[model samples]
Target: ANPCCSNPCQNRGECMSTGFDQYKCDCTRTGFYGENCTTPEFLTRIKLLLKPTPNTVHYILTHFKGVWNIVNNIPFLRSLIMKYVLTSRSYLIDSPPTYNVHYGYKSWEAFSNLSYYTRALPPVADDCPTPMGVKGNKELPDSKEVLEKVLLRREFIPDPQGSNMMFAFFAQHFTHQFFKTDHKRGPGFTRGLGHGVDLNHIYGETLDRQHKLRLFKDGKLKYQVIGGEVYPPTVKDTQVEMIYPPHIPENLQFAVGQEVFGLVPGLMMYATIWLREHNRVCDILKQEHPEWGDEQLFQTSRLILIGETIKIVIEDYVQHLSGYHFKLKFDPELLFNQQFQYQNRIASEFNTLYHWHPLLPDTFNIEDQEYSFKQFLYNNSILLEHGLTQFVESFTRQIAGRVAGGRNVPIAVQAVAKASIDQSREMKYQSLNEYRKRFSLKPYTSFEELTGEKEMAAELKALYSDIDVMELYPALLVEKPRPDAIFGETMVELGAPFSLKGLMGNPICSPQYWKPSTFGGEVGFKIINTASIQSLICNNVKGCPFTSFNVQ
Candidate 1:
């Protein structure tokens, strides 16, 4: 009369004998989840809609915009509709809806090991694109050459949605926030399992790295004067080892958090702006609470800046990226009542799709001179010479390459495209059609339907005869970009769940921490409330007056 003897589980869920007459169904690695493995991963439905299809997202947004117009002038009514739109749009719940590994949210090791990423679909074997027959197949196209051919940019086509170089620049810096992976552990693992939306790039992630840049006297990060303008301390100033191209000069290399930021000029430009901002705010906190020591002042200002970063990201950065008619907001207060897991797990698939190397033009137009991508790499002198405002203001006027595929990535950096495919394969992800379906999107019926270009469709079909076998990494970037958005339908939908979860799930967004009391009194709260990309640029940097995320 044992409970497990009956084998109550279904769909390949192994029923294991337990203590007494009980049993457990181990759903580990199965493409389904639930008490008995009856549910397909990442699936939920609405009446008449059946799924959150491509049509559903757009349809909901358009109608919400109409509602917004009607309530535009009424604050209380507008807030209600805004909450409704966000509740409907944001997937407050994590995908797959399973977290047994956390052991009821108590295991430190399991919590620390949680994937920085949550999958749109369940795990697949490393050898994907299997032959429908019993025998396994690992053969796929040689992505290096193919991706180079497909993604190499021939000309600079502007972002169709009017985004500028600064938008891509901000995107480069923003994704670097948590886009770290373990090199020894390979692409399957992440370095930020226990963290969320923390600006690790600007402020170092660990204490050892943080101490190198802190000035204990005031609640400010260390910096030096260059041409009468404040900038991040140089390698010589901080004595930190920064890997740079030998020809780039050791003296010019920046001793900043996130070694990756030191190499790109646009990245350094943003980092310098943030460094000044953190120090400037410290001065304010010091004045208000003179009794507060460096520890309290720094800690309080840090939280305020974190909230400020989130504000700019949602209000300006994502607004342009989404091109939504319903204005995107940084209001996390609505999340207080929503049903959600307070955990933020970034997905490998999410990281893979955001490569966006193509958004950078082949050349950076700065101070009436252009530097090719190869010349631009590892060069810090370009930024030091012109100062922050001159370099940044120039970026606002230039156009970035379109985010869509088809020779968009410059030849110099197209290797990143190949690496993206390689990592996607290493993670053993599913096909384009399979991934699309999981995002509640309809699978493409034909190659033409997916590509929207007859010639590109022919190439994809010639390489992969079936649409179901086209690896998602390449196809995710190749799909026809939404006319109103910066990315394709699949890229936008696939990223939304994880991105929204990451932003809203932050502890700062919680009711207990979001109040003015938590951010260092009303004055500090007002400072955080007013933070924006425009404010960050105008106040911190010298000599620049005007800026916008889009090209004019």
Candidate 2:
């Protein structure tokens, strides 16, 4: 008479023979726990209720630490604790290889579709109740509400060491190069493949389908010239004014990158430079191939522009941010790698992870004239009002904010983070810890180990006691920063693969596309390889102060 003959283990639990008529039950389901699989589901739910959620725990611990005030009314102890915590510095070491070769479902079709990415979470019965602590303990707030309050209440802490605006401009430029306008208006999650930079100028596909007719005779992209300066095309029946040159109408609208063109002075400046560059390339190609028609010149010029954009981004922009100057290289061979499949689709997670709003300064300093960051929000008048030269002068001279922890982040960044998380939750993404394990990284066992911040870890433990239950966004924020990297380790791990794959997938970098006849050959290579942010400004905008390629 073996006890196993009676089927003592229930709900698909496997009973293993221990020895001598003894057996053990293995509980495999999510909510089940206890020897012999006999624990009640309600009991398990009640146990989870004892631990608060991560957000709730973090809020109270971080905000309620004033208990020290009562204890340290003696004074000297308070100063000592502040000095020690504030003065300590972390060390940096070179990180190891972290790129993913095999793309996961989350990186592929699952998170790629915008409609799916933005869909609401399905309604399901939740067994675990919201954890409210014992008497004298306040009810734990909802995670979303707590996150919103945390963002609003946090103060901005400026970086002692700052970078210049070239990085800022490059970020905007590079971001525009690939992702923009979301799925509703823009290209949606398609593989970038240089569509944003190329098709955008010719047809305005990201916005309305307005055609920008080219002038083959003059070898230039058509533009409305006002006061001897080339301006973007004007929109019909719109009172929005783009520039304010002495004789130009205030209500005249200038068009370029429809999704972002008129939003910021920095974006406008880059848009204008590329617009000018396009015509300039057309003129050069026209001289080289006088037999070529307007279409030929336009197509070739667009190719040249895309190539130059890629070169600058990989060689300069990424190099600066990665600090892995030598490790990250632009190899044309990657364009021919057959083993790797190329999907021209952008991942939703890629967009969600790219919350670089922290890099933007609250205000821009132009030629010693300080402009409120809010004042320039969605306003491109500065470019036309003061001229491209003035705008370039101001941007090149100003330093950008650091992209580190939440200490100095702006309210807009905070809001963006919360919105991204809310959207992700609605879309039902896998747990952050699961993603870490999927990526071949070890899943954290404790909150302290996850964030490398004892206080943050303690708060996280109080809320999500189970490591697997932690949400992605909050976990990303707390993970220790990688050696010499701006973002934490998890972000670097997630972003590197998507970004590198996007670049490699583009056909523009293919040797077939780079041929002498197709891409303008040696001349095209020279143009693309030689172009830099510093050169683009100096060549296009007169009296530009930036001289070196290095953005300090």
Candidate 3:
């Protein structure tokens, strides 16, 4: 029999046959090392040694006893070491749960439909009082009055340790690029096809054809080079919009919405960075595979861009927001799990839950000069007034507003809450208590328990006499936050699953995407692990001060 045929090597090691009737074993996984790859490595053995057992009483006691004294005596030093070294090392071991473990149900069965979950209660006239003579009007009591009450209370709370306003804007832009739910439009409103990050660059399919025709040349996306900074091509808009700065050439526009990239300087800057990154990747791929045509290069580069995006969002963005760096991970198996049905559609409730307008600061501070929200609203002139580097620097130094649940929220966020609830009512979404019960959480028996403040609870109680009729948006805003979590438990339960499943549902992570003949094995993995916001800025932005994790 052939020596390799015996399969003597353990732990999935490959057996290579030698001509002299001998075999060698190559260990593929990380934890084993030996001639036959049978013995556990030192670290693996140490882990086993530390594991609890009946006879490990002495071992466990001695192990902790040694470090406990040092931790107590030099607390500050220990914290510094932990902050710098231990946490970094722990990240490698902290992997997120596989899709099978997290989303055990098939995709179609995983989420409950809004109709089945929502309970529509009649509008209580006494509970929700309207101004004189406005009670019977169709739009007055429901939309405008409800909105006024929701926005009536607003307070500013500061985050002692949180990201800045730029971070908030970046997150919004990033989210827009990733997922946007398609609502039914005009004449018999019905849902439409949704999209994942897909990295189409135009944000939505409606703009794809127009934007593509305008921006593509010879089957590849076109770019405009000005002052050594790369930008997406501009189009002519006769809409007479004044949100943009006067310096932005008259009739020249970029991207889909003037509100996003055309209005905010910081968003405009980052959007330019991503646009450049995509084209840069395309150029690199073209050089490596000259035989490949423009379409192949464009698609392949888009795949790599999306891969890099997923890596940054999961490893960095979500980690910072979650404050659970070691607990979440990007596991490939989750994407390919057979049991889960991975639907890429965005849920309407998700839109309602993601209302983080509270995080938006009233004014943006650029190099010690402050500009009100209105001044920055549609003004891309800031990019011209103070170059990109200074804008990035200002964001790095400033901290974002507070986003914790039950805390004071901004009027903008309050309006968002009211609008979300109004839309939900129109769509007939489930009551707040019903959704909670469906999520496997105990329903709040009283308003006091929900808000944790007697005054706020009293207001809610007066509005909705019965707890069962409470609205979804207000409940989410008032519910107590999970331990160490920035948002309430309901938000986490709803948002995390959908967001993760959406990414995995994309075909980009599959073997078909990373085929050696196409995206290539090495390039695909590299794209998934490497690249970050920090690296992109450092590589492209001039004279950037690598000061904090925000850039990273």
Candidate 4:
């Protein structure tokens, strides 16, 4: 019998007899070609699988180039390309007025390659807003800035022994468990913690460990459980466990075209700019640095790529700090209404708004209104006092208390915030709606629903009677300047050092004036205009007559 008759080539290739007990094989044709046709074209097929065809690439390039030519020259694409590479911050630009005129292939190639690389590569980054690595020591250089502002804060901490190995083990194990559970559900397995692992617990522990802090009581040890059983590992199993590579316990097929989506604002912004102005970028580089060559451009592009990577890492960290998976259901109006309700003693405005309470009068300071605005404020305040206390208690019981681990700072901070809010609520109220009705000669309706005022007052007093202002006042230390103001101040702190100018054309050193200040104004305007244009375009393309295209 010939070797081919025994099916020696397996299913991948065909076996043919050349001699006794020897075979020349012919492979399946789909992705196979070689001497005796024995070799399957695995590499060729893989290349085809990974990348779009040359014809498609050329078509896209030509279309983009043609669009550039139509708008101005292809040189105008430089700025567009740069937009995709470095950040569009003022600090990054060398010659602002002349920048609109340069053009180069480096920026374009970098833009194109980054787009392709990011699309092809798995995410090595995250969506959080905080910077990666340890929180920096104040004694060192806090962070490095690109296009102005310290976008990446660098802090180094010595890793605990076996920390890396332990992390690798856990990450692989967690990822395997996730894929195993979610393989049937779809690629959206990574949608959030709700879909796969209990991310809050896992990440919370991992972060604590990474920070060299304790997961339970502050300590430098971790407890491991195996096979749904917790016990001290025996000698042989312990060694084996440490040595064995973590593997997926089960294997499942993932569709080749499956995509992982995330909102990376820094990357998004970079991509937006590059696509808009590639040509201008090229011209400027050639003119400004006559001695510089393609290698320099490549280097610059590489730096841009690295910077973007850092940004994505930072974003993920910030998201974590903001409390991922913590379900907070405060009504947006609650922030405004607390002021109206508490200091002024207003009645519950919830009946009027339905969802919550009316945050504010549509028109403030309206005279001739029949209702007692002061009474309304005070009544609302009483209701708010009770509601917020309940809210905080619930929040602490569920999330904050656990996370903070008896840290008095957080509790105190929350209390101070509440107290200050109560203080701010003592405001005079007027009704602009009544004034408007009077001016227009419109009839106004009277409120006749007066029930036991004495009972209502008694209830209000009982609700707010025991609130501990003194106990909570100490907590306000951590809540100073407000979070948003703190962020803005941080931005300024980061921006000012790098000679970066704010979008409104004001440098950091300049005194900020709201009336004449267009420096900060420019940033907001640019963002607003861009968003408006994007919304308009999306609506037109997605909702109207231009939904589809006919190739014919």
lDDT winner? 1
Ranking by lDDT: 1, 3, 2, 4
Clashing pairs in 2: 52-463, 53-463, 157-408, 191-344, 191-345
Give Cα distance to truth, residue 357, candidate 4, Å. 25
How well is each residue in 247-334 modelled by candidate 2, as lDDT tens digits?
Answer: 4344445666444556677777777777788888877887778788876777778778777776676666665665431223354553
Candidate 3 Cα outliers beyond 4 Å, as residue runs: 1-153, 178-192, 201-220, 237-252, 256-260, 334-338, 412-415, 483-485, 515-517, 544-552
TM-scores of all candidate predictions against the true structure: 0.86, 0.68, 0.67, 0.15
The models' CA-based lDDT, in order, is 0.72, 0.54, 0.54, 0.22
Candidate 2's error at 532, in angstroms? 2.1
lDDT of 3 by residue, 193-282 (tens): 333566543333445442442334322555566556555555553231223466667523665332346766667777777766666676
TM-score of 3: 0.67
Q: What is the C-alpha RMSD of each candidate to the true structure, in Å?
A: 5.6, 14.6, 16.6, 34.7
Which residue runs of candidate 1 sit more than 4 Å off their true CA positions? 1-46, 50-53, 56-72, 89-118, 126-138
Off-target runs (Cα >4 Å) in candidate 4 are 1-267, 274-280, 289-293, 301-552
Query: Candidate 4: global Cα-lDDT?
Result: 0.22
Across residues 318-418, which tens digit of lDDT does each residue of candidate 1 receive? 77777766666677776677765565677677778888877888789987899997778778888988878887788888888777745677778766777
